[PDB]
Write a protein that binds this DNA or RNA. Structure first.
Length: 1108
RNA sequence: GAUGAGACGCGUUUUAGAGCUAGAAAUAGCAAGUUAAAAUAAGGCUAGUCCGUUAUCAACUUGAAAAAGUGGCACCGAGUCGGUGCUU
DNA sequence: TTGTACTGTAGC
DNA sequence: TACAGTACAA
């Protein structure tokens, strides 16, 4: 009657088992539908559900964000063309059309093949006069004569399309662009972060060293030689190496137990820093971001090398000089190679495949690969000294479009565009009428707090309009309601407190959150108040020596004090307090308790917004308290991220008996100390009661709102479905208790507790019909290790179901609390039939791989556009199949035409999924199938199970790919032998337990020679990999004499042959066995298709040999 | 630890940037190369400077969908479950 | 002309 | 890890 269900949730597996009060798994004759001969199969109430991991939305957001950027960039180009078209029509009728159809082959091109002028003579004249776009840009800046309108459009479109970054706010000035200024800023925060043993850099010249044209290591060494107190391996040298773009090791300087490294690579814009500051703390992030902006200063000064003259547009002239040096150095390299090393001349300049100059230009070889290829060549070749330093300084034969251009601010392109429009203002009146329009097209950026400019049809937009019309950059300021949109951004961006999920979290930099983390570290209150007022409110970093010298000896008059709470220095700090004291300089204003809301609203404003306008509006309310220079400075300050506690928790809720908040208890608790975890946990405090009341609020309400990765949510939803089907199996009877694995544990317990215990009374608040019991994995693992019921991951996926049954057994034994019970548990662990089910899931994602392949005559290339034939324009490859579809039809075959019936699978890809589901019959008719029988169309997702002769099971991975779907049910004594054979000298138990394991593995060593026969039999029956079987048998026979460790580890990798899933390449001692791929789905046309439920206890078997 | 907004720079793809000479040639020698346009998931309609890779998904019967419903028990054994006995 | 075998490919 | 490209058996 009464029964228990034990569960085991993982990221990719949910194992389940049903036990009785005698710790036995029941077995029932489950009915099976379908046209097969079998009507009922005996199945056991134990199994596991296997599924592909749940994915974070992050990659989908990266794609979504880029998808908007390309759209808005095309819209910018369209705005510029909209401005230009009316005047351009009387100059060239089909210029924009030619620029649109420039991608097309000449046969598909309606107009002339030359995009700019449409005549070959003028195009050749253009390319001779301006070999790059920057020559045209520099001329248009530096010429007063009337220029052609189309070249002006080309220059402005090149600057509007590729407009550079917005990281620097305001106009360009040396205070944030000249390398010396931000170098002094870097050493300023370097001194502020420690203030013990600082570095002082006053007489040094940064622009002489960092902007010098020299190799990077030599520049670093010279800068280190300018500072005798620091070295290259020092933390300052580490920071300067980051500024130079090297790969320094911060873990060495901060004594981390694991390697931590950073570099500002071409598409990792300091985002790797999370793994470092998760360990070393967030105090150093201001050091690293200043290093990043100093790096941007160094690159900007490097590529603006012509800024030594004010005579022209700096970036265009600098690219011109780079082109000139590239040409003059290239002809020298060609002569130097041809004169003295005629061999490999063709390899460098003609081959275009071996990373030469031809591979640098016409091939996919980067700058550093090209340098690495030719560096041995230049070491061998003579006369290369003046040219090799260009490799050592990364200046040799550089292109104009490179990864370093990400450091270019938008102000440079803005200045060049302004210079062009001011130079051509009188010649074209519509430039005078639309100078501000084009400058606004270049300089407009959608704010943080606005989001997508939608009209209700977006999941993501909170943007609120004040009018119903099209939004352009010119009329943006009078259409969006900024107050409503910014307010709506706050309502979304506030996180909620994990203790009280109704309540808004504080800013991380919030002053009360600083006081919290300080006082929580000291309690691990007159003395507390004196220490905080004397040191913490005076200095950023306080050590134990400062406490014993400046407080205990000075105030308490204690000569010798021993402190054990804190080792060296306090991790917490009042940094926001000292920051405010630096900016406002009216210290007593923060002493007034009334102003706390004003201060925390200010730091809330800076933690919300990044743009100047809304920040200016929100703090402008406080202008009657203070004014002028303090706003003028604090408008540049910003903060990032959020605390754990709500403002509603920390000082908001008051204990119902003591009349004190959490921070009130932290400040004073009488003659003894108490910490935050205890303040929540102590039953003497009503915080325990109030949190356990207020923490609780459909299944999706709990799953969507709770904190966790989509990977662990998937196991929770599947574990609820498994519970529902197991209740359905047992006559709708509920379990006596449900056992769960292991802070997510209390949310999983709430979901199952609330789905089972739906009844309540007037006096009983909750009737515990079912007791959801939570256990820790340490207990089950210790039970497994102590009593010889060992497990491995490599033999089979039966360990999930065995883990679930052990969870059930230990949980029931614990709530109720060595003979027949041990025999029962050993019989169940050696019990062969376990309902392993791989979840059949329609594949979703990108419908193909992202790499665009060149043109070819194959029909397998996917068209990148509707009118772009992939035989001519290239296209994508490797499409992803959402699901396969079993079709029977007639196919037109042969020159002498007849209609032959065929049955075959066809893969419906993701892009053809919707077109298939609108009309399957016409979609199949378009593929050549005619007389298609509609009712026999069977949808076959990924992991569809088929059964063939001798119990051979195959899982469908695609339309033309199968997978191994059988489990090797090796007996429990052999898995015990295998586990004890491995880990031979690392049990870390008693020596006697060690030796009773060793004689067990030794004197049954013929078990190994029997398990290899087990592998051979199982593989010959269901795997059909005979060549690999002979290979592994020969390798096992000729490595028989190698001892227990290596042999019984390589035989653990040997089960990769018999493991269900894709065939993977395992390895023996030395030999590596290539996988045997099942690239033929012809055999499952006459197999038995298996429709397994979530538990797999209910099946619907269709015999496909009776169809067609 | 979840989620979201705004931006940059590469990369790839086709085309434009007239290749020259010896050549019956399959080709050989030389010259040249750095840039730009267009696309960046096919596309969708409420046509927005929006949306399109996350989450959900065994089979059957109802239901536009949502959603609901659909499958006997005990014992003896074990090569992916078998056999025996009651029951409608 | 249709199936198999082996090796290579895949955005940041 | 499923698909692509080249290379053979009929």
């Amino acid at each position: 009657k009464k029964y228990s269900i034990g569960l085991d949730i993982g990221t990719n597996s949910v194992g389940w088992a049903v036990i009785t009060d005698e710790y036995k798994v029941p077995s029932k004759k489950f009915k099976v539908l379908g046209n097969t001969d079998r009507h009922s199969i005996k199945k056991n109430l134990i199994g596991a559900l296997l599924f592909d991991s749940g994915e974070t939305a992050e990659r989908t957001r990266l794609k979504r964000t880029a998808r908007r950027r390309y759209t808005r960039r095309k819209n910018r180009i369209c705005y510029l063309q909209e401005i230009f078209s009316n005047e351009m029509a009387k100059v060239d009728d089909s210029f924009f059309h030619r620029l649109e159809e420039s991608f097309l082959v000449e046969e598909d091109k309606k107009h002339e093949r030359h995009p700019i002028f449409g005549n070959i003579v003028d195009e050749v004249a253009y390319h001779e006069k301006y070999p790059t776009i920057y020559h045209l840009r520099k001329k248009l800046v530096d010429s007063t004569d009337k220029a052609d309108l189309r070249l002006i459009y080309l220059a402005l479109a090149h600057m509007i399309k590729f407009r550079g970054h917005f990281l620097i706010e305001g106009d360009l000035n040396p205070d944030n662009s000249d390398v010396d200024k931000l170098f002094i800023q870097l050493v300023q925060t370097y001194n502020q972060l420690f203030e013990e043993n600082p570095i002082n850099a006053s007489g040094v010249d940064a622009k002489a060293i960092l902007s010098a044209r020299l190799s990077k290591s030599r520049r670093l060494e010279n800068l280190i030689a300018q500072l005798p107190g620091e070295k290259k391996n020092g933390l300052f040298g580490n920071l300067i190496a980051l500024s130079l773009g090297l790969t320094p090791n911060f873990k060495s300087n901060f004594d981390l137990a694991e390697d931590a490294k950073l570099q500002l690579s071409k598409d990792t814009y300091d985002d790797d820093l999370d793994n470092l500051l998760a360990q070393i703390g967030d105090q150093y992030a201001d050091l690293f971001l200043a290093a990043k902006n100093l790096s941007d200063a160094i690159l900007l000064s490097d590529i603006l090398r012509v800024n030594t003259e004010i005579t022209k547009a700096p970036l265009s002239a600098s690219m011109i000089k780079r082109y000139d040096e590239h040409h003059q150095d290239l002809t020298l390299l060609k002569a130097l190679v041809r004169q003295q090393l005629p061999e490999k001349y063709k390899e460098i300049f003609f081959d275009q495949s071996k990373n030469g100059y031809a591979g640098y230009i016409d091939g996919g070889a980067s700058q550093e690969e090209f340098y690495k290829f030719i560096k041995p060549i230049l070491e061998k070749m003579d006369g290369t000294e003046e040219l090799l330093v260009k490799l050592n300084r990364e200046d040799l034969l550089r292109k104009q479009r490179t990864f370093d251009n990400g450091s270019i601010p938008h102000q440079i392109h803005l200045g060049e565009l302004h210079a062009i429009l001011r130079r051509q203002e009188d010649f074209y009146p519509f430039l005078k009428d639309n100078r501000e329009k084009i400058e606004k097209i270049l300089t407009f950026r959608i704010p943080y707090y606005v989001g997508p400019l939608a009209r209700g049809n977006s999941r993501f937009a909170w943007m609120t309009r004040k009018s119903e019309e099209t939004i352009t950059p010119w009329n943006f300021e009078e259409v969006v309601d900024k107050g409503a949109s910014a307010q709506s951004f706050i309502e979304r961006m506030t996180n909620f407190d994990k203790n009280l999920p109704n309540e808004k979290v504080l800013p991380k930099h919030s002053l009360l959150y600083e006081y919290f983390t300080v006082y929580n570290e000291l309690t691990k209150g007159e003395q507390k108040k004196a220490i905080v007022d004397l040191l913490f409110k005076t200095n950023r970093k306080v050590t134990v020596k400062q406490l014993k010298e400046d407080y205990f000896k000075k105030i308490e008059c204690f000569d010798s004090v021993e402190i054990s709470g804190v080792e060296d220095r306090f991790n917490a700090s009042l940094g926001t307090y000292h920051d405010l004291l630096k900016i406002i300089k009216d210290k007593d204003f923060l002493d007034n308790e009334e102003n706390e809301d004003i201060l925390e609203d200010i730091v809330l404003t800076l933690t919300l917004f990044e743009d100047r306008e809304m920040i200016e509006e929100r703090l402008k309310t406080y202008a009657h308290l203070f004014d002028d220079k303090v706003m003028k400075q604090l408008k540049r300050r910003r903060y990032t991220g959020w605390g754990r506690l709500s403002r509603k928790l920390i000082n908001g809720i008051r204990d119902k008996q003591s009349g004190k908040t959490i921070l009130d208890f932290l400040k004073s608790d009488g003659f003894a100390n108490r910490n935050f975890m205890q303040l929540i946990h102590d039953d003497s405090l009503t915080f325990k009661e109030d949190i356990q009341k207020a923490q609780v609020s459909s299944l999706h309400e709990h799953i969507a709102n709770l904190a966790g990765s989509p990977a662990i949510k998937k196991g929770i939803l599947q574990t609820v479905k498994v519970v529902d089907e197991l209740v359905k199996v047992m006559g709708r009877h509920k379990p006596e208790n449900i056992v769960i694995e292991m802070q997510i544990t209390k949310h999983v317990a709430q979901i199952l507790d609330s789905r089972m215990n739906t009844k309540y009374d007037e006096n009983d608040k909750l009737i515990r019909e079912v007791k959801v019991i939570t256990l820790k994995s340490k207990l089950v693992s210790d039970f497994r290790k102590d009593f010889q019921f060992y497990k491995v991951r490599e033999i089979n996926n039966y360990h999930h179901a065995h883990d679930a049954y052990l969870n059930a057994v230990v949980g029931t034994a614990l709530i109720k609390k060595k003979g027949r019970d041990f025999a029962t548990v050993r019989k169940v662990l050696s019990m062969p039939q376990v309902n392993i089910v791989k979840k059949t899931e329609v594949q979703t994602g990108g419908f193909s791989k992202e790499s665009i392949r060149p043109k070819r005559n194959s029909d397998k290339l996917i068209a990148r556009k509707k009118d772009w034939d992939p035989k001519k324009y290239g296209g994508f490859l490797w499409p992803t199949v959402a699901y396969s579809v079993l079709v029977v039809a007639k196919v037109e075959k042969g020159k002498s035409k007849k209609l032959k019936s065929v049955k075959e699978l066809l893969g419906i890809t993701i892009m053809e999924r919707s077109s298939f589901e609108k009309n399957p019959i016409d979609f199949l008719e378009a593929k050549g199938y005619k007389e298609v029988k509609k009712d026999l169309i069977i949808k076959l997702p990924k992991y569809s199970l088929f059964e063939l002769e001798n119990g051979r099971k195959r899982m469908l991975a695609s339309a033309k790919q199968l997978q191994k779907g059988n489990e090797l049910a090796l007996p429990s004594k052999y898995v015990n032998f295998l586990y004890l054979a491995s880990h031979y000298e690392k049990l870390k138990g008693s020596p006697e337990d060690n030796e009773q394991k060793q004689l067990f593995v030794e004197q049954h060593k013929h078990y190994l020679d029997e398990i290899i026969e087990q592998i051979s039999e199982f593989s010959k029956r269901v795997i059909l990999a005979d060549a690999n079987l002979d290979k592994v048998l020969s390798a096992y026979n000729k490595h028989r004499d190698k001892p227990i460790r290596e042999q019984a580890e390589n035989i653990i990798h040997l089960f990769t042959l018999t493991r269900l899933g894709a065939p993977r390449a395992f390895k023996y001692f030395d030999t590596t066995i290539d996988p045997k791929q099942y690239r033929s789905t012809k055999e499952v046309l006459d197999a038995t298709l298996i429709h397994q439920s979530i538990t797999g206890l209910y099946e619907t078997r269709i015999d496909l040999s009776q169809l067609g």
